[PDB]
Amino acid sequence: AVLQAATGMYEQLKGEWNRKSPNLSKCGEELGRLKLVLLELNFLPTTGTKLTKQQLILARDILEIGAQWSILRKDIPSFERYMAQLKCYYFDYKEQLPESAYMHQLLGLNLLFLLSQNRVAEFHTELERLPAKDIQTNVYIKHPVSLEQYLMEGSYNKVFLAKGNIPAESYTFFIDILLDTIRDEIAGCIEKAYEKILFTEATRILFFNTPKKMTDYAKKRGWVLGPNNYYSFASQQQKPEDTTIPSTELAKQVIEYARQLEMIV
Amino acid sequence: MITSAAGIISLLDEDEPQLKEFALHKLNAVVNDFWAEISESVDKIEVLYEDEGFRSRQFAALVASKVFYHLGAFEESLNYALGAGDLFNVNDNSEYVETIIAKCIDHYTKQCVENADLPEGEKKPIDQRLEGIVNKMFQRCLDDHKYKQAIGIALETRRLDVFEKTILESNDVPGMLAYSLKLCMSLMQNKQFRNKVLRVLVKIYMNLEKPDFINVCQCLIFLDDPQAVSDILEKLVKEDNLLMAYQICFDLYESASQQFLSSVIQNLRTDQTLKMIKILSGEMAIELHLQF
Amino acid sequence: RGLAVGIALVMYGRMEEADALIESLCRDKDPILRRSGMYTVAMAYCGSGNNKAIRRLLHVAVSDVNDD
Amino acid sequence: DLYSRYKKLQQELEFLEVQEEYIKDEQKNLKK
Amino acid sequence: STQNRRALDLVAAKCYYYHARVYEFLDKLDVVRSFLHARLRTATLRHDADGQATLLNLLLRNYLHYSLYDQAEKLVSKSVFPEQANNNEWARYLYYTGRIKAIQLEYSEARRTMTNALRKAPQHTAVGFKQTVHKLLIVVELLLGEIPDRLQFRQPSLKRSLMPYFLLTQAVRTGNLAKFNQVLDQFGEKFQADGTYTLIIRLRHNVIKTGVRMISLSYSRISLADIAQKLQLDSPEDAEFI
Amino acid sequence: GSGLRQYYLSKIEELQLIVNDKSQNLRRLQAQRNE
């Protein structure tokens, strides 16, 4: 009875979301009313034995549309809430449940999500949850992991090129969030890398389209422009400051040696 | 299964109270297995208990207590176990219940020990929930006929009421009195509280059907109460039990200071009373000794 | 020497009420008055088994200037 | 005898602290 | 479980080890987690050092068998391993913790632990455990930018097993992407079956890092097109960002 | 059918481990002093 009503309710959410112009807030109310019904129908079953698979098959779906709907309105906490619950239905009860078609898509979104928020330590942990085979074969998983390497080795050219070859349309949101971080990271190198770089020379380095987009970013970063269209980055004078002997730190250490020689008794 | 509790924990920051309540009923089933990850989300579960209007705020306190009990922060674990109130069933045989019970008694004992020597006006009020559970704990020995165990905790927690109650309800009153007296002198090193134990121990001796007067006088020497000793002895002559006061006096002289006996003589003055001071003054006791 | 034994008996069986006197006697520059503190500890803590008093006697026994 | 064992152990522990404090003190003066 | 003896705990620790072993060959490994967690509290509250050390190690092996690296990290963050534990249990704990740290990008603390696990390992037996720890330590040392000891590849027990990692260490040391990728395309399946593939993939950054390090160490002024050739990068524009 | 028998024994066994540690340590310190 309840299961039949919930399944019928899920399609009306499925029907509205599948349409070419999904109704976000009007899906949200359907989403909010759907999670309450799943509560009675064994939501997140503790040590799921051979119970009804329809509830397990169902509850996985509303989270799948639920997680994908969160990025549609571009909010962070909703995605974490839905994906955290969805991860339970992906790895825990997988003996009973079949392999979801969208599972690798949504897992890749979570991995790309962690990169956008610089939770790289959590990125590799959740990456271990996937088998080693599909890391190098599945397109939805290969794209985020390769992007992490590109970010780490400094292939900032490929990070901006990652926009074009995304695996699916759902990945767009988290890519822009990452690209805002990349822009500061690229220029962060330039201050310590380049002792002076020309005005339109840094246009492709910063991946700026219009020269005006440099002007607002220049004052935000406080870049003193030179008369010859050059940015002077004289800031290496702030050396590790070997000019000063750390006498107190050294005296602290040498005293400890004397303690480890005399205090022993 | 349920390898990660992140999904269940994710059901805590929703605005629907029904959603939070279901997650709490899910966390307690896995608190014994997945406490490590819940420990990083306790701040989202003690606020639920902190909220007054929450329906399951008492349930939230119980689960948080379980997480802290597993975590090792027993001081925080009991504080939430008391918050659970009726949901923390003392009759359960679970390890969590018995471990928090032990921590509760020790925490109650430390407060009572600290509170015993404190002045009355500075006495920090022991929490009612903390006292209620230990009182059920005290009753368990009375129900389970473990009177010697209940005597010891009563002394540790400085409660003479339960201490008095245990001896009277015990089947072997004279045996429990002797066991309590031996502990009162061999193990108790706080004089101000040891006297209180003797001040109630004298009461039980008084209310006994046959008042064993000999041990009373021994306890009264420790309490340094010549007036009591003189009174119990003076009524002994009126009650015609001259044999007991005759034995009582030899015990006073053998094991009491002369100043204690001197104060008894004055109270005795205020025939047989004259022969009574004869033993107390000691010139008779040395006579039998010298004759020996 | 007579006073050292005498001072101890004044505070016999006095438990912690002899703490003020004992610390005054033990810190004294006079070796005999320091001996009176040892005797005061004995009489004030006779049969009590007070580990704080035993801690003090053992400290003086192993670390003191006067053998008496 | 269950309380007595607990209290007897408590005194025996406290005595061990006294003994271990005096041994360290004696070792300091034995070196002198 | 019913008994509360003190000497039985030393016996109990061995029983718990084999109790996880019978389920290891039963390929369940999940119903034991509840038993292991429940028994761990029983041991911890009683200060059973021997049982607590074994129970914590078995739980980490339980978590790591299913790639529950997040779950295992939480447990080691809160639980305290017994200091007075058996050296054989210290060896497992240091390996399991070191494997966790390696996944969590805590390479420096990982290297110290696996080195300690090797030291506490039995000196004449436990060859397989030495192999597994050596395999992970080689990756971590390469992941840390250091160079693995050449001696360990010479041992008769480790020679055949460390051969794929010996070729991989050589590729990382020269700091050229071309040789590093050849090892991955040749020994990728071996690394996957070894549980070390994911940590190998991050070595591509270290190959570039050490290749750049040799470039600056050797060239006072070098063209960016040349740097792309010595690192076998794609374009000098890519070497410019790198 | 017990009261704080489990609680008492928990306290007693906690002290016994602590006592055994210090008696082992004290005998080490005593041997150092005796030498």
Curated annotation (Swiss-Prot), chain A:
GO term, biological process aspect, one: proteasome-mediated ubiquitin-dependent protein catabolic process
Domain PCI: residue ranges: 77-246
Gene Ontology cellular-component terms listed: cytosol; nucleoplasm; nucleus; proteasome accessory complex; proteasome complex; proteasome regulatory particle; proteasome regulatory particle, lid subcomplex
Keywords: Isopeptide bond, Phosphoprotein, Proteasome, Ubl conjugation
Residues carrying Phosphoserine: S21
Cross-link (Glycyl lysine isopeptide (Lys-Gly) (interchain with G-Cter in SUMO2)): K212
Family statement drawn from the similarity comment of this UniProt entry: Belongs to the proteasome subunit S14 family.
Description of how the protein assembles with itself and partners: Component of the 19S proteasome regulatory particle complex. The 26S proteasome consists of a 20S core particle (CP) and two 19S regulatory subunits (RP). The regulatory particle is made of a lid composed of 9 subunits including PSMD8, a base containing 6 ATPases and few additional components. Interacts with DDI2. Interacts with TASOR.
Protein name: 26S proteasome non-ATPase regulatory subunit 8
Naturally occurring in which organism (per UniProt): Homo sapiens (Human)
Highest classification ranks of the organism: Eukaryota, Metazoa, Chordata, Craniata, Vertebrata
Gene that this polypeptide is encoded by: PSMD8
Full protein: residues contained: 86 to 350 of 350
Curated annotation (Swiss-Prot), chain B:
Residue numbers carrying N-acetylmethionine: M1
Top-level taxon in the UniProt lineage: Eukaryota
Quaternary structure note: Component of the 19S proteasome regulatory particle complex. The 26S proteasome consists of a 20S core particle (CP) and two 19S regulatory subunits (RP). The regulatory particle is made of a lid composed of 9 subunits, a base containing 6 ATPases and few additional components including PSMD1. Interacts with ADRM1. Interacts with ZFAND1.
UniProt family annotation: Belongs to the proteasome subunit S1 family.
Function of the protein: Component of the 26S proteasome, a multiprotein complex involved in the ATP-dependent degradation of ubiquitinated proteins. This complex plays a key role in the maintenance of protein homeostasis by removing misfolded or damaged proteins, which could impair cellular functions, and by removing proteins whose functions are no longer required. Therefore, the proteasome participates in numerous cellular processes, including cell cycle progression, apoptosis, or DNA damage repair.
Protein's name according to its UniProt entry: 26S proteasome non-ATPase regulatory subunit 1
Organism classification: Eukaryota, Metazoa, Chordata, Craniata, Vertebrata
Portion of the full sequence shown: 1 to 341 of 953
UniProtKB/Swiss-Prot annotation, chain D:
Coiled coil: none
Compartment list: Cytoplasm; Nucleus
Taxonomic superkingdom: Eukaryota
Spans through the membrane: none
Protein function: Component of the 26S proteasome, a multiprotein complex involved in the ATP-dependent degradation of ubiquitinated proteins. This complex plays a key role in the maintenance of protein homeostasis by removing misfolded or damaged proteins, which could impair cellular functions, and by removing proteins whose functions are no longer required. Therefore, the proteasome participates in numerous cellular processes, including cell cycle progression, apoptosis, or DNA damage repair.
Subunit structure of this chain's protein: Component of the 19S proteasome regulatory particle complex. The 26S proteasome consists of a 20S core particle (CP) and two 19S regulatory subunits (RP). The regulatory particle is made of a lid composed of 9 subunits, a base containing 6 ATPases including PSMC4 and few additional components. Interacts with NR1I3. Interacts with PAAF1. Interacts with TRIM5. Interacts with ZFAND1.
Family to which this protein belongs: Belongs to the AAA ATPase family.
Record's protein name: 26S proteasome regulatory subunit 6B
Source organism of the structure: Homo sapiens
Gene for this chain: PSMC4
Swiss-Prot record, chain E:
Keywords: Isopeptide bond, Phosphoprotein, Proteasome, Ubl conjugation
A molecular function GO annotation: enzyme regulator activity
Highest taxon of the lineage: Eukaryota
Presence of keyword Phosphoprotein: yes
Domain PCI: 91-242
GO biological process, one term: ubiquitin-dependent protein catabolic process
One of the record's GO cellular component terms: proteasome regulatory particle, lid subcomplex
Chain positions with Phosphoserine modification: S223, S235
Family label: Belongs to the proteasome subunit S3 family.
Subunit structure and binding partners: Component of the 19S proteasome regulatory particle complex. The 26S proteasome consists of a 20S core particle (CP) and two 19S regulatory subunits (RP). The regulatory particle is made of a lid composed of 9 subunits including PSMD3, a base containing 6 ATPases and few additional components. Interacts with UBQLN1 (via ubiquitin-like domain). Interacts with ERCC6.
Function text: Component of the 26S proteasome, a multiprotein complex involved in the ATP-dependent degradation of ubiquitinated proteins. This complex plays a key role in the maintenance of protein homeostasis by removing misfolded or damaged proteins, which could impair cellular functions, and by removing proteins whose functions are no longer required. Therefore, the proteasome participates in numerous cellular processes, including cell cycle progression, apoptosis, or DNA damage repair.
Name of the featured protein: 26S proteasome non-ATPase regulatory subunit 3
Species whose genome carries this gene: Homo sapiens
